Design a protein around this ligand. Structure first.
Ligand SMILES: [Zn+2]
Lengths: 98, 43, 72, 85, 76, 43, 27
């Protein structure tokens, strides 16, 4: 908040609170980047796409890890719809009584 | 390619870039096995 | 034999009674050769489909769960 | 009873419809009308022949039968109707 | 030395098991899915928090005044 | 450090057992206190 | 889109197969 204030521009406190919450989710101040919360996405394709590396794919292949595809980044990679916004809502329709 | 004719195959619509990535990983010793699932929500 | 499956009612068949549309779709898809397992019979009697049906991304048709009679 | 604000949120969103659900309803209805579904509102006397506009007007009127089932994280499911008879 | 009196430190409390059960049933989550705090953290050690417990933390926030958050106590 | 991992295992098993309503709150509290006392004595 | 699950399956009646096919032809 102080850093954003000295530049004189306004950013809502809710965004800063969310960022600080996601930094300290694991009990310690964890780096946002590849060694931290981005490092543990519980997914392989998103991890390999964030930074262009092959080591993560080979590590997953060796450990036999499987990707659940519950996130957003890897769903776009293959083509299936994401579960944010319009994804979260699912509809039911009865066309008989129209 | 592996099972010959005895197995059933299902069509899946994906980006061709993902298929290229799968085949490039398969050119390695990595063996990605795509797991299919019902297109409908089922329930 | 009692079989429950999902039937895809296309948008153009909207406003008609669900049961007749569902049995028409099942007959069109399962008039002969059935499926690989549990017989290859061509027989089918009738069906009853639930009114509420799902809508899936990229498809305007409605997907209903229907239980029906085969002649395995 | 997680918190007071959670209760306010839950009782607020019971009788209202979010913009994501509105967009999904409109897109689904437009896709249905494009393939050949018969519109429920009167086709004539409409300034716009676009399918999107017809679906939007149907949603505003409430004629189209669509029920939105929202699954709460604790397993509760809520059904919200758009008929508005 | 006591650090709980510092301005940066919110109010930490250890809630009973029935309240934790009600919380996890209402949230519909496993207890480990909550954000978790190490049992060796000085704020948890001051109140004598034990692993497997849930800590109720009230923070001062400008939107609601007092905000209630729940942390999970893990082992080291 | 194996004591900490084993304690985490036992605590999550007790919590999952509680979520299935195998036994009431008070017995689970006794189990938590007992395991904490037992495996903090070693440390 | 086509998930088939057979429950409480019953044997095809050879004697009543003629009746079933006659009913199908009627329909
Ligand atoms: Zn094969």
């Amino acid at each position: 908040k102080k850093v954003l204030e000295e530049q004189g521009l306004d950013v809502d406190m809710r965004h800063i609170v969310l960022v600080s919450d996601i930094m300290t989710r694991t009990g310690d101040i964890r780096q946002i980047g590849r060694h931290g919360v981005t490092g543990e996405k519980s997914s392989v394709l998103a991890r390999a796409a964030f930074e262009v590396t092959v080591k993560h794919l080979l590590d997953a292949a060796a450990r036999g890890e499987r990707e659940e595809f519950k996130g957003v980044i890897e769903n776009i990679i293959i083509g299936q719809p994401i579960r944010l916004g319009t994804g979260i809502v699912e509809l039911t329709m009865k066309p008989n009584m129209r | 390619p592996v099972h010959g004719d005895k197995s059933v195959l299902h069509p899946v619509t994906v980006s061709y870039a993902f298929k290229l990535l799968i085949q490039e990983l398969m050119s390695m010793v990595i063996s990605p096995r795509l797991i299919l699932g019902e297109k409908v929500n089922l329930g | 034999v009692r079989a429950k499956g999902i039937v895809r009612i296309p948008p153009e068949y909207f406003g008609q009674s669900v049961d007749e549309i569902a049995i028409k779709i099942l007959r069109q898809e399962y008039q002969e050769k059935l499926i690989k397992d549990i017989g290859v019979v061509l027989g089918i009697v009738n069906a009853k489909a639930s009114e509420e049906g799902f809508i899936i991304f990229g498809d305007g048709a409605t997907y209903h769960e229907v239980e029906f009679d085969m002649l395995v | 009873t997680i918190d007071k604000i959670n209760e306010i949120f839950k009782e607020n969103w019971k009788n209202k419809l979010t913009k994501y659900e509105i967009a999904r309803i409109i897109s689904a209805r437009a896709l249905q009308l494009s393939m050949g579904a018969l519109p429920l509102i009167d086709t004539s006397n409409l300034k716009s022949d676009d399918v999107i506009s017809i679906a939007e007007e149907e949603l505003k009127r409430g004629v189209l039968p669509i029920t939105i089932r929202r699954i709460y994280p604790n397993g509760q499911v809520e059904l919200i109707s758009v008929r508005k008879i | 030395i006591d650090i709980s009196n510092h301005e940066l430190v919110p109010k930490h409390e250890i809630l009973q098991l029935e309240e934790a059960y009600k919380l996890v049933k209402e949230l519909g989550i496993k207890p480990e899915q909550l954000p978790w705090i190490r049992a060796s953290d000085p704020v948890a050690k001051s109140i004598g928090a034990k692993p497997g417990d849930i800590i109720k933390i009230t923070r001062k926030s400008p939107f609601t005044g007092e905000s209630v958050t729940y942390r999970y106590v893990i082992t080291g | 450090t194996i004591s900490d991992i084993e304690m985490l295992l036992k605590d999550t098993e007790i919590w999952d057992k509680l979520l299935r309503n195998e036994l009431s709150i008070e017995e689970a509290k006794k189990m938590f206190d007992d395991v904490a006392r037992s495996y903090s004595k070693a440390d | 889109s086509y998930s088939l699950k057979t429950i409480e399956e019953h044997f095809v009646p050879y004697s009543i197969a003629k009746k079933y096919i006659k009913e199908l032809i009627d329909t």
